[PDB]
Amino acid sequence: IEEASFLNGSDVVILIDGVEELYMEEIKADFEQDEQSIKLLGCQNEISRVGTTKGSFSLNGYKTDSKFAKLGFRSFEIIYNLSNSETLGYESIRLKNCRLKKLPLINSKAGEIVKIEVEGSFRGYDLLNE
Amino acid sequence: IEEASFLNGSDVVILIDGVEELYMEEIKADFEQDEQSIKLLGCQNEISRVGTTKGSFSLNGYKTDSKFAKLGFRSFEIIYNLSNSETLGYESIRLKNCRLKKLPLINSKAGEIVKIEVEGSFRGYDLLNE
């Protein structure tokens, strides 16, 4: 019903190691189970339990510097804020111990704008606001 | 915000073993982890650590000579320069010990321009400029 509840991608600000990142196209982050399946002798359905949690992120954008190449495989943090405009509420998520799986050293095509895409893993998250 | 920060593919010059390559369509280079996953008895999230680093490149272009067929599987270097025009800044990346995974001996279609595509691996990189 309420039009105002929907949140657009334009209400997004990303901070990589405390400095705002402006030239990003999309971002993803998931906190995934290693779900443990259990089968019992007296019971005829599988029982699922929570396993170890791992974080995975991807982060696609437009290249304007060699920030990620300098950044290397050092650990960093990602603070992601998604705000509402019609309402004043906002969500803020801090991904901790983020680390790149691979360095986007070179990615260019003949007549397109140079884009940068990275992926990696993070240990845990803090839901700062909501 | 700033229009000038974006970098186009047209501001690209590639040097294969010190001689400029002019007929290239796209280039890729990644420096990938063999990320080590750690699970601990007292802790309920996976710990990720940096493993050995490997480089992988791909390099697609238009065929004008048998350069890569002569080049064989010998080691070579790739210097990649991406310049800004509105600004005077530029990035330069040197891929070292580059080596082809396969030789593009023949690749032709009925009525299309003969293209050449290669892939390979490199040991390390030097971020010469930025």
């Binding site: 600000v13 901070l15 603070i79 804020n81 700062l128 606001n129 | -």
Partner: protein
Amino acid sequence: ALQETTKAWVAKNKELGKDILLFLGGKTEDNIKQINDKSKSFNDENIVNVGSSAYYENIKYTPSEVAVYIAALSVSKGITGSICNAKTIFEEVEPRLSQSEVKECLKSGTLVLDFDDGDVIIVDDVNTFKKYVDDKNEAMGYISNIMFINTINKDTSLKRKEFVGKIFNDATGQTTVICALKKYFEELMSQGIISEFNVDIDTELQATAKADEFYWKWDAVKVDVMKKIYGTGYL
């Protein structure tokens, strides 16, 4: 007179923001009631008095001189430690009291050394602010909690050298602020000093804030340390 002057000095410093924990000691002439009254006279969070002299390497130390070592051990423990029953180097102390009398003296707010075994041991980690009131809590009447609160107030107060006059007052800046403060608390939690914590924006006050003002709040729960242990025997 010197105790009073240094008391006013540390009070001025605390009002200015500089936290100094003052340590003192009574004279040898004072009897048990007199030293208890002297301690109750001091009702400051960051003032400590030693009401018992000691002997070490056969040389005597008056309670004020022993307060030097007491302060030194308190500072050495700092955080992640306390001097409630620490093994002091002193080999004899005076005067001595019964358990009910030690209870009365501690309620008055006197630090008293005791010769529990061949080496001297402190009775409890208490400050002159044992005399509390209902509007305040009981946990702050101990030296460890004073040092812990002072360390937090300083450490958060150390975050001005890159932070005040050098950051914006928008959502990005406030979130960086909360991230830094949370980082300090998380590293503090890493030593086991705290069991749980919270750091967030103080929305109630921040709604009425002026443009320049930034308001935040924090919670913490210090980890419990065993002090009293009771064993019920049977045969």
